[PDB]
Design a protein around this ligand. Structure first.
Ligand code: NAG
Ligand code: NAG
Ligand code: NAG
Ligand code: CA
Ligand code: CA
Ligand code: CA
Ligand code: CA
Ligand code: CA
Ligand code: CA
Ligand code: CA
Ligand code: CA
Ligand code: CA
Ligand code: CA
Ligand code: CA
Ligand code: CA
Ligand code: ZN
Lengths: 132, 276, 48, 276, 276
C-alpha cells in the first residue's frame, strides 16, 4: 500500500491510505466557560478531550437552564481536522463518560480550582455536521 | 479591558497549579469582624482588640488590616448593614424567638441584591419572578398589602381603607416581603420611619460569612419552602465564653476565608456589569 | 327546518360555540407557533 | 386494564420529553391546605379564604379546586388525619414540647400504612419486621406492654397483674408503638377511649407534604435511630406573620406540588393491589 | 405496576397448575367476621370468640388472624360500614321488613364505589349514567327531590317551597337514591344528621362476602329492575341456633374464602373511595 501510494503520488494520481482508528486529533483536554465567576459556582460551558481518533465533549450548565430562553442551553464544539478524511465510519454515542463524574479542575489561568458535579441528561437536538 | 461584554474563556486541563496565594491575599486584604456588644461586655478587657490583632498577625494578617465593628444586637444591625472589608465575618448570637429575623439578616447580607426605589404612594407594585422581593429597613417598618384584581379593585381589602389591608410586617427593623407574583398590590408602609425597596437576588455574596453562635440549623436564606440550603459561608458554633469563640475564629481564619471569595461584583473586572 | 325567531341568530349561535371548541384552539395554537417561529432567530430550539 | 399483576415496562433512553403537564394537573386536580385555628385567628379576616383562592387562580388553580381545612392543633388533628384532596399541604406549627407528637403525625401522614385490627385480651401480638408498628389513636391512648417469653410468662411483668405492665404511652391522641420483634406481648390499652391497629409501613405517601412553621429540623418519621430522612415532602419555614406564610405557600405552589406526586396506591392503575 | 397496567399478559394453555395456596393464603391473611348483637346474646358465653379462633386454627388460620366485629342491627351497621380484614364475612340476619335496607347494605359492601361530596345547598345535581347513584348515610337521612327542566324551573315542585318536593327517603340510616339520569335535581337533605355523596359503582368488591341468615333470596344489589344477580359472595343459610351458624361458617371457611378474591382490600377500611 505504501509503495503503491508513493508511485501514484509521483504520478500526480489520487491515492489514499486506509486507517483503522486514524490518529488525526492532536491530544487536547480543555474546557471553555461561556459563563463563569471568581467563585465558580454558576458555570456554563463545555469540556472536551480529542485524543487520536476519539472525541468526547460535554456541555454543562450549573443552573440546568433555569433562566435560559425556553429552558434550552446550546453547546457547540468544532474540531478542525488537519487533513481531509474520506469514507469514514464513525460511532456516535449520546454520552461522554470522561466528563460524567465529579472532578476538581484547575482554572483557566491556574489560579484556583473549581468543582464539577455532573448529573447526566440526554443531549437534545444533536446535530453532527461533517464539513469540507 | 473589554468591560461591557461577557467573553468565553478557554482553559486547558493539565495546566500546572499556581502556588498558594493565601499569604498574598492575607497581606493585601482587610478582614472585618462583626460581633455583638455582649461579646465585649463578657470579655471585659479594654485591650482585647490589640490581643486579637497580634494573634491574627501570628496567623498572617498584617497588624493594620483586621477591623472590629460592634453592633448592639441582630435587630439593630439589620438596619442598613454596611460591610466594606474585603472579607466580612459576622458573629450572630442565636435566639430561638428571632429565627425569622436572623434568616432575613443572613439573606440580606449573604446574597447580592439589586434594589430600585419604591413609591408606595404613587404606584401599585408587582413582583415579576421568584428572585424579586420587597426589602424594607428602618427604625419601625410596618407593611400592609392589598392585592388588586385585573380591574384594580382590591381582593379581600378596600384600597380606600388601609384598615382592611393585610398586615405582613409589624415594627420590623428589617423585613423581606414575598407576595404572589404577577399580582399588583397597593402598599401601606410607615415610610416616615422606614424605607422599602424593590430588589432582585442577583446571587451569592461571597465575601460575607455568618457564624451562628450557639443555636441550631435554622437559617433559611431562600423564600422557597422546598429549599433551606446551608452554604459554606454560614457556620455554626457552640459556645460558653466569647474568648473561646474569638480564639476559634482566629485559629480557623484560614478555613473561614477559604469558605469565602473576593466579591465578584467588586474589583475592576466587574466593571460595567453592575459595579466597578 | 327554520323555527323562526331562532334563524335570527342561527349562524352566530353556532359560531359562538365554534370558536370556543378544540378545533379553534388548535388553529390558534398553530398560528401562534408559526408566528413565534417566524419571530425567532435563536428562540427556535424549543421546536422539536 | 391488567390490574392486580405487575408487568415490566420497557422504554428507550431517547424518547423526547413531553411538554409540561403542570397546567393540566392544576386544572384537573384539587389542593387541600391544612392550617391551625390560630392561623385564622392571627390573620383576623374572614374573606381570606376567597383571597387565597383568587391568588391561587393567578397560579392556575381553578376557582373551587383549592380547599382550606382547619384543625385546632397537632394533638387534635392527629386523632384521625383524613386527607382527601389530590394534593395535601399541612402547615404544622413547631413546638418543642410536642416534638415526638409532630414526628408521629408526620410519620402517620407522610407514609402509607396497611392496618389490621387488634383485639387485646384475646390475642398476643408480635411485630414481625421493621415495617410493623402499632398505631393507637383516640381521645386518650394509654398503652402498657408486657413482653412474654417462649412459655407465655411475662418478662418483668405478670400476665394477670396489669400494674406490672411496662407503660409505653400515657393519654396520647396518637402514638406509634415499636416493640422488640419476635417477642409476644400482652397489651393493656384504654379500648373504650382509644383504638390500636397493627400497621405495616408499605412506603411513602407522595400526595401529602408537611410545612413546619418555625423551629428546626426535628421530624423523624423512621423508627430506626440510625436514619432521620428529611425527604423532599418535609419543608421548613421561618415566620412571624401567618399572611406571609400563606403568601409563601401560594407563590411557591409550583415547587410544593413538584415535591409531591399523585397517590400511587390510589388512582385506577393501582387497582386490585390495595385500593381503586 | 401502573406503567405496566395497560400492557398485555400472555400465558400458554399448558402451564402446570401450582399447588394449593389455601394454606399460604390463610397463613398470611386476616379474617373479619361481622355478626349482630343478638348472636352474642343468644350464645351467652364470654369465651365464644376464643373458641371460634381455636376452631379456625384447627382449620389452618393462625391464632391472631380471625377478628370478630359486632353491630347492633342492619340499620346501625349501614352507617359508614368499615371492612377491616383481608376477608370480610358479614352474617346478616334476615327480616322481611328490612328487605330494601338489606339490599342497600349488600350493594354498598359487595361493590366498590367512588364517591364525591355534594353541596346540595349550592348546586343542582344530576346522575350521569346507570352507574351513578347518590349514597346517603347518617343518623337520620331524609332525602327529598325536586326535578327541574331546561329552564331550571321545577316540575311538580317549587324550588323555593320544599314542602312540594318529592320525598324519596325518610328516617334512613343508609339509602341509595337513583333518579332519572340527565335531569338536574334540587335536593333537600337533613345535612345535620345526614351526609349525601355522588357515587359511581366501579365494580365488584370480591373480598366482602355476605351470608344471609334466614329468609329467601331477596338481596338486589343492582338498581336495574331487569337484573337481580346472585353472586358467589351472596350466601344464604337457614338457622335455629347461632352456634350452628358459626360452626357452619368455620367448617366451610375454605369454600367461603374460595368464593372471595384477595387484593381487593383498600388501604382504608371505608366502604367507598372518597375523592374531592
Ligand atoms: C512556587 O513554589 C515553588 C516551590 O515552593 C518555588 O520553587 C517557586 O519559585 C514558587 N514560585 C513560582 C512562581 O513558581
Ligand atoms: C407547552 O409548553 C409551553 C411552555 O411551558 C406552555 O406554555 C404550554 O402551555 C404547553 N402546552 C401547549 C399545549 O402548548
Ligand atoms: C407441590 O406439591 C408436590 C406434590 O406433593 C410436592 O412434591 C412439591 O414439593 C410441592 N411444592 C412445590 C413448590 O412444587
Ligand atoms: Ca424581621
Ligand atoms: Ca382584609
Ligand atoms: Ca413573589
Ligand atoms: Ca426556604
Ligand atoms: Ca403522641
Ligand atoms: Ca414491670
Ligand atoms: Ca418492632
Ligand atoms: Ca429515626
Ligand atoms: Ca335504607
Ligand atoms: Ca310535589
Ligand atoms: Ca339514575
Ligand atoms: Ca335489580
Ligand atoms: Zn475558571
Amino acid at each position: 500500500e505504501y509503495i503503491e501510494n508513493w508511485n501514484l503520488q509521483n504520478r500526480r494520481q489520487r491515492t489514499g491510505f486506509t486507517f483503522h482508528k486514524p490518529n488525526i486529533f492532536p491530544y487536547s483536554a480543555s474546557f471553555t466557560l461561556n459563563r463563569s465567576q471568581p467563585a465558580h459556582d454558576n458555570l456554563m460551558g463545555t469540556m472536551w478531550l480529542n485524543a487520536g481518533s476519539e472525541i468526547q465533549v460535554a456541555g454543562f450548565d450549573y443552573s440546568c437552564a433555569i433562566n435560559a430562553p425556553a429552558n434550552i442551553q446550546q453547546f457547540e464544539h468544532i474540531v478542525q481536522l488537519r487533513r481531509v478524511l474520506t469514507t469514514a465510519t464513525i460511532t456516535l454515542l449520546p454520552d461522554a463518560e470522561r466528563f460524567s463524574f465529579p472532578r476538581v479542575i484547575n482554572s483557566a489561568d491556574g489560579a484556583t480550582t473549581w468543582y464539577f458535579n455532573p448529573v447526566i441528561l440526554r443531549p437534545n437536538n444533536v446535530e453532527v455536521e461533517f464539513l469540507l | 479591558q473589554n468591560y461591557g461584554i461577557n467573553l468565553p474563556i478557554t482553559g486547558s486541563m493539565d495546566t500546572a497549579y499556581a502556588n498558594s496565594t493565601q499569604e498574598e491575599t492575607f497581606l493585601t486584604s482587610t478582614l472585618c469582624l462583626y460581633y455583638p456588644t455582649e461579646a465585649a461586655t463578657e470579655i471585659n478587657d479594654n485591650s482585647w482588640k490589640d490581643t486579637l490583632s497580634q494573634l491574627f498577625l501570628t496567623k498572617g494578617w498584617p497588624t493594620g488590616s483586621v477591623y472590629f465593628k460592634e453592633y448592639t444586637d441582630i435587630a439593630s444591625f439589620s438596619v442598613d448593614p454596611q460591610l466594606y472589608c474585603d472579607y466580612n465575618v459576622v458573629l450572630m448570637k442565636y435566639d430561638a424567638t428571632l429565627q425569622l429575623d436572623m434568616s432575613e439578616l443572613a439573606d440580606l447580607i449573604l446574597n447580592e441584591w439589586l434594589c430600585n426605589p419604591m413609591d408606595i404612594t404613587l404606584y401599585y407594585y408587582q413582583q415579576t419572578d421568584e428572585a424579586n422581593k420587597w426589602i424594607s429597613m428602618g427604625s419601625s417598618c410596618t407593611i400592609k398589602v392589598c392585592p388588586l384584581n385585573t380591574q384594580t379593585l382590591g381582593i379581600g381589602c378596600l384600597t380606600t381603607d388601609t384598615a382592611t389591608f393585610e398586615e405582613v410586617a409589624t415594627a420590623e427593623k428589617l423585613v423581606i416581603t414575598d407576595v404572589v407574583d404577577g399580582v399588583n398590590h397597593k402598599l401601606d408602609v410607615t415610610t416616615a420611619t422606614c424605607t422599602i425597596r424593590n430588589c432582585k437576588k442577583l446571587g451569592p455574596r461571597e465575601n460575607v460569612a455568618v457564624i451562628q453562635v450557639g443555636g441550631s440549623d435554622v437559617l433559611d436564606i431562600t423564600a422557597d419552602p422546598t429549599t433551606a440550603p446551608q452554604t459554606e459561608r454560614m457556620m455554626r458554633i457552640n459556645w460558653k465564653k466569647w474568648w473561646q469563640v474569638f480564639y476559634t475564629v482566629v485559629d480557623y481564619v484560614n478555613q473561614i476565608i477559604q469558605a469565602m471569595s473576593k466579591r465578584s461584583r467588586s474589583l475592576n473586572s466587574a466593571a460595567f456589569y453592575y459595579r466597578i | 327546518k327554520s323555527t323562526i325567531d331562532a334563524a335570527k341568530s342561527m349562524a352566530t349561535s353556532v359560531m359562538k360555540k365554534f370558536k370556543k371548541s378544540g378545533l379553534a384552539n388548535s388553529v390558534s395554537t398553530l398560528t401562534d407557533s408559526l408566528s413565534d417561529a417566524a419571530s425567532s432567530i435563536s428562540r427556535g430550539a424549543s421546536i422539536r
